[PDB]
Design a protein around this ligand. Structure first.
Ligand SMILES: Nc1cccc2cc(O)cnc12
Ligand code: NA
Lengths: 244, 10
Protein backbone atom coordinates (compact mmCIF):
# COMPACT_ATOMS: atom_id res chain seq x y z
CA UNK A 1 0.00 0.00 0.00
CA UNK A 2 1.02 3.70 -0.73
CA UNK A 3 0.54 7.06 1.23
CA UNK A 4 -2.69 8.33 -0.47
CA UNK A 5 -4.00 4.68 -0.13
CA UNK A 6 -3.10 4.49 3.61
CA UNK A 7 -4.84 7.88 4.16
CA UNK A 8 -7.86 6.61 2.14
CA UNK A 9 -7.95 3.66 4.59
CA UNK A 10 -7.73 6.10 7.62
CA UNK A 11 -10.71 8.13 6.24
CA UNK A 12 -12.71 4.91 5.50
CA UNK A 13 -12.21 3.32 9.02
CA UNK A 14 -13.10 6.69 10.70
CA UNK A 15 -16.32 7.06 8.60
CA UNK A 16 -17.26 3.36 9.25
CA UNK A 17 -16.83 3.99 12.97
CA UNK A 18 -18.79 7.34 13.06
CA UNK A 19 -21.69 5.67 11.15
CA UNK A 20 -21.79 2.75 13.67
CA UNK A 21 -21.63 4.66 16.96
CA UNK A 22 -24.54 3.74 19.26
CA UNK A 23 -23.81 6.88 21.34
CA UNK A 24 -22.67 10.30 20.04
CA UNK A 25 -19.69 11.57 22.05
CA UNK A 26 -21.22 15.11 22.26
CA UNK A 27 -24.42 13.60 23.77
CA UNK A 28 -22.28 11.74 26.38
CA UNK A 29 -20.36 14.94 27.33
CA UNK A 30 -23.56 17.06 27.48
CA UNK A 31 -25.09 14.48 29.91
CA UNK A 32 -22.20 14.65 32.46
CA UNK A 33 -24.07 16.62 35.15
CA UNK A 34 -27.19 14.30 34.81
CA UNK A 35 -26.22 11.98 37.69
CA UNK A 36 -28.40 9.35 39.46
CA UNK A 37 -29.57 10.37 42.96
CA UNK A 38 -28.79 8.28 46.11
CA UNK A 39 -32.47 7.08 45.89
CA UNK A 40 -32.01 5.92 42.25
CA UNK A 41 -28.70 4.15 43.11
CA UNK A 42 -30.52 2.44 46.05
CA UNK A 43 -33.30 1.50 43.59
CA UNK A 44 -30.68 -0.22 41.36
CA UNK A 45 -29.13 -2.05 44.34
CA UNK A 46 -32.60 -3.30 45.45
CA UNK A 47 -33.17 -4.97 42.06
CA UNK A 48 -32.86 -8.75 41.90
CA UNK A 49 -29.59 -10.30 40.60
CA UNK A 50 -31.53 -11.79 37.59
CA UNK A 51 -33.29 -8.50 36.72
CA UNK A 52 -29.96 -6.63 36.71
CA UNK A 53 -28.23 -9.41 34.66
CA UNK A 54 -30.98 -9.32 32.01
CA UNK A 55 -30.88 -5.48 31.70
CA UNK A 56 -27.08 -5.49 31.33
CA UNK A 57 -27.12 -8.45 28.81
CA UNK A 58 -29.70 -6.58 26.71
CA UNK A 59 -27.59 -3.31 26.82
CA UNK A 60 -24.45 -5.32 25.84
CA UNK A 61 -26.33 -7.03 22.94
CA UNK A 62 -27.43 -3.61 21.60
CA UNK A 63 -23.79 -2.36 21.81
CA UNK A 64 -22.63 -5.67 20.04
CA UNK A 65 -25.19 -5.10 17.19
CA UNK A 66 -23.44 -1.71 16.42
CA UNK A 67 -20.01 -3.49 16.50
CA UNK A 68 -21.41 -6.10 13.96
CA UNK A 69 -22.42 -3.16 11.68
CA UNK A 70 -18.90 -1.56 12.17
CA UNK A 71 -17.32 -4.91 11.01
CA UNK A 72 -19.62 -5.08 7.93
CA UNK A 73 -18.64 -1.49 6.98
CA UNK A 74 -14.92 -2.12 7.71
CA UNK A 75 -12.86 -2.19 4.48
CA UNK A 76 -11.76 -5.78 3.77
CA UNK A 77 -14.05 -7.59 6.32
CA UNK A 78 -16.92 -8.63 3.97
CA UNK A 79 -14.23 -10.03 1.57
CA UNK A 80 -13.15 -12.63 4.23
CA UNK A 81 -15.01 -16.02 4.26
CA UNK A 82 -18.12 -16.30 6.54
CA UNK A 83 -16.21 -18.66 8.96
CA UNK A 84 -13.48 -16.01 9.51
CA UNK A 85 -16.06 -13.21 9.89
CA UNK A 86 -17.83 -15.25 12.64
CA UNK A 87 -14.49 -16.14 14.32
CA UNK A 88 -13.37 -12.46 14.36
CA UNK A 89 -16.71 -11.18 15.72
CA UNK A 90 -17.09 -13.99 18.35
CA UNK A 91 -13.61 -13.21 19.73
CA UNK A 92 -13.65 -9.43 19.12
CA UNK A 93 -17.21 -7.96 19.48
CA UNK A 94 -16.99 -7.77 23.35
CA UNK A 95 -13.39 -6.42 23.22
CA UNK A 96 -14.56 -3.62 20.81
CA UNK A 97 -17.55 -2.76 23.18
CA UNK A 98 -15.05 -2.64 26.16
CA UNK A 99 -12.95 -0.04 24.25
CA UNK A 100 -16.10 1.95 23.07
CA UNK A 101 -17.23 2.03 26.80
CA UNK A 102 -14.39 4.50 27.75
CA UNK A 103 -16.46 7.23 25.94
CA UNK A 104 -19.44 6.64 28.33
CA UNK A 105 -17.03 6.75 31.33
CA UNK A 106 -16.47 10.07 33.10
CA UNK A 107 -12.97 9.92 34.66
CA UNK A 108 -13.59 13.26 36.56
CA UNK A 109 -16.07 11.56 38.98
CA UNK A 110 -15.71 7.79 38.11
CA UNK A 111 -19.26 7.55 36.61
CA UNK A 112 -20.74 5.71 33.67
CA UNK A 113 -23.66 6.71 31.46
CA UNK A 114 -26.20 3.93 32.05
CA UNK A 115 -29.94 4.09 31.23
CA UNK A 116 -30.14 7.90 30.79
CA UNK A 117 -27.86 9.08 33.67
CA UNK A 118 -24.34 8.81 35.14
CA UNK A 119 -23.69 6.55 38.13
CA UNK A 120 -20.71 5.09 39.99
CA UNK A 121 -19.84 1.36 40.10
CA UNK A 122 -22.18 0.88 43.19
CA UNK A 123 -25.11 0.93 40.62
CA UNK A 124 -24.11 -2.63 39.53
CA UNK A 125 -23.87 -4.16 43.08
CA UNK A 126 -26.96 -6.47 42.55
CA UNK A 127 -25.04 -8.33 39.69
CA UNK A 128 -22.74 -10.01 42.25
CA UNK A 129 -19.62 -9.51 40.08
CA UNK A 130 -17.88 -6.58 41.87
CA UNK A 131 -14.35 -7.62 40.75
CA UNK A 132 -15.42 -7.71 37.06
CA UNK A 133 -17.23 -4.32 37.31
CA UNK A 134 -14.29 -2.57 39.10
CA UNK A 135 -11.86 -4.03 36.46
CA UNK A 136 -14.00 -2.66 33.55
CA UNK A 137 -14.17 0.71 35.42
CA UNK A 138 -10.30 0.68 35.95
CA UNK A 139 -9.85 -0.25 32.25
CA UNK A 140 -12.23 2.63 31.25
CA UNK A 141 -10.27 4.99 33.58
CA UNK A 142 -6.95 3.97 31.89
CA UNK A 143 -8.27 4.62 28.29
CA UNK A 144 -9.91 7.93 29.39
CA UNK A 145 -6.50 9.11 30.74
CA UNK A 146 -5.08 8.66 27.16
CA UNK A 147 -7.64 11.30 25.92
CA UNK A 148 -8.58 9.12 22.90
CA UNK A 149 -9.94 10.98 19.91
CA UNK A 150 -12.92 9.48 17.97
CA UNK A 151 -10.51 8.77 15.04
CA UNK A 152 -8.07 7.01 17.39
CA UNK A 153 -10.92 4.83 18.79
CA UNK A 154 -12.02 4.03 15.17
CA UNK A 155 -8.49 2.92 14.16
CA UNK A 156 -7.74 1.12 17.40
CA UNK A 157 -11.08 -0.81 17.49
CA UNK A 158 -10.60 -1.79 13.79
CA UNK A 159 -7.32 -3.44 14.96
CA UNK A 160 -9.05 -5.05 18.04
CA UNK A 161 -11.39 -6.77 15.51
CA UNK A 162 -8.92 -7.62 12.66
CA UNK A 163 -6.61 -9.85 14.70
CA UNK A 164 -4.80 -12.56 12.62
CA UNK A 165 -3.82 -14.53 15.79
CA UNK A 166 -7.50 -15.55 16.52
CA UNK A 167 -7.79 -19.40 16.82
CA UNK A 168 -9.97 -20.87 14.03
CA UNK A 169 -9.08 -18.57 11.08
CA UNK A 170 -8.97 -20.39 7.75
CA UNK A 171 -7.61 -17.53 5.60
CA UNK A 172 -4.94 -16.46 8.14
CA UNK A 173 -2.63 -14.81 5.51
CA UNK A 174 -5.59 -12.71 4.20
CA UNK A 175 -6.44 -11.55 7.82
CA UNK A 176 -2.66 -10.86 8.33
CA UNK A 177 -2.57 -8.55 5.29
CA UNK A 178 -5.78 -6.68 6.33
CA UNK A 179 -4.27 -6.33 9.90
CA UNK A 180 -0.91 -4.95 8.61
CA UNK A 181 -2.81 -2.42 6.41
CA UNK A 182 -4.93 -1.25 9.40
CA UNK A 183 -1.77 -1.14 11.59
CA UNK A 184 -0.10 1.21 9.00
CA UNK A 185 -3.37 3.27 8.82
CA UNK A 186 -3.36 3.46 12.65
CA UNK A 187 0.40 4.26 13.07
CA UNK A 188 0.41 6.73 10.10
CA UNK A 189 -2.51 8.68 11.70
CA UNK A 190 -0.75 8.79 15.15
CA UNK A 191 2.48 9.93 13.41
CA UNK A 192 0.59 12.60 11.36
CA UNK A 193 -1.23 13.87 14.50
CA UNK A 194 1.88 13.76 16.81
CA UNK A 195 0.23 11.10 19.01
CA UNK A 196 2.83 8.26 18.89
CA UNK A 197 3.36 8.88 22.65
CA UNK A 198 0.14 6.81 23.26
CA UNK A 199 1.56 3.51 21.74
CA UNK A 200 3.47 2.72 24.99
CA UNK A 201 0.37 3.80 27.03
CA UNK A 202 -2.09 1.46 25.19
CA UNK A 203 -3.57 -1.60 27.07
CA UNK A 204 -1.20 -4.59 27.32
CA UNK A 205 -1.74 -7.69 25.14
CA UNK A 206 -4.06 -10.01 27.14
CA UNK A 207 -5.91 -7.28 29.12
CA UNK A 208 -9.05 -7.24 26.81
CA UNK A 209 -8.87 -11.07 26.72
CA UNK A 210 -8.76 -11.15 30.57
CA UNK A 211 -11.92 -8.91 30.86
CA UNK A 212 -13.83 -11.04 28.23
CA UNK A 213 -12.88 -14.30 30.03
CA UNK A 214 -14.00 -12.84 33.40
CA UNK A 215 -17.30 -11.75 31.73
CA UNK A 216 -17.82 -15.34 30.39
CA UNK A 217 -16.83 -16.82 33.86
CA UNK A 218 -19.34 -14.54 35.72
CA UNK A 219 -22.10 -15.31 33.14
CA UNK A 220 -21.45 -19.09 33.72
CA UNK A 221 -21.92 -18.65 37.54
CA UNK A 222 -25.10 -16.62 36.90
CA UNK A 223 -26.40 -19.22 34.41
CA UNK A 224 -25.80 -22.02 36.98
CA UNK A 225 -27.97 -20.08 39.55
CA UNK A 226 -30.75 -18.96 37.10
CA UNK A 227 -30.74 -21.28 33.95
CA UNK A 228 -34.35 -20.55 32.98
CA UNK A 229 -33.70 -16.73 33.13
CA UNK A 230 -30.82 -17.14 30.60
CA UNK A 231 -32.75 -19.61 28.41
CA UNK A 232 -36.00 -17.53 28.47
CA UNK A 233 -35.06 -13.83 28.81
CA UNK A 234 -31.47 -13.34 27.64
CA UNK A 235 -31.04 -12.03 24.04
CA UNK A 236 -30.33 -14.74 21.41
CA UNK A 237 -27.15 -12.97 20.10
CA UNK A 238 -25.77 -12.66 23.73
CA UNK A 239 -26.36 -16.43 24.37
CA UNK A 240 -24.77 -17.29 20.97
CA UNK A 241 -21.57 -15.29 21.83
CA UNK A 242 -21.17 -15.97 25.57
CA UNK A 243 -23.26 -18.93 26.75
CA UNK A 244 -22.53 -21.54 24.03
CA UNK B 1 -27.86 -18.59 13.96
CA UNK B 2 -28.12 -14.82 14.89
CA UNK B 3 -24.58 -13.76 13.80
CA UNK B 4 -25.01 -15.55 10.36
CA UNK B 5 -28.34 -13.64 9.90
CA UNK B 6 -26.77 -10.21 10.79
CA UNK B 7 -23.88 -10.81 8.35
CA UNK B 8 -26.25 -11.93 5.49
CA UNK B 9 -28.71 -9.02 6.03
CA UNK B 10 -28.23 -6.47 3.17
N1 LIG C 1 -17.40 2.42 30.87
C1 LIG C 1 -18.27 1.56 31.56
C2 LIG C 1 -17.77 0.66 32.49
C3 LIG C 1 -18.64 -0.16 33.19
C4 LIG C 1 -20.00 -0.10 32.98
C5 LIG C 1 -20.49 0.79 32.03
C6 LIG C 1 -21.86 0.86 31.82
C7 LIG C 1 -22.29 1.80 30.90
O1 LIG C 1 -23.62 1.96 30.61
C8 LIG C 1 -21.40 2.61 30.24
N2 LIG C 1 -20.08 2.54 30.44
C9 LIG C 1 -19.63 1.63 31.32
NA1 NA D 1 -14.03 8.57 29.33
Amino acid sequence: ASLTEIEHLVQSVCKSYRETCQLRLEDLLRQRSNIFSREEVTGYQRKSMWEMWERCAHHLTEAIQYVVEFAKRLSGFMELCQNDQIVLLKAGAMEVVLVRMCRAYNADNRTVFFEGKYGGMELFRALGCSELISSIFDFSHSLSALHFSEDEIALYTALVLINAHRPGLQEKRKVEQLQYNLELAFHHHLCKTHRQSILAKLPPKGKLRSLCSQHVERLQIFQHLHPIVVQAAFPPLYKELFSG
Amino acid sequence: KILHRLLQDS
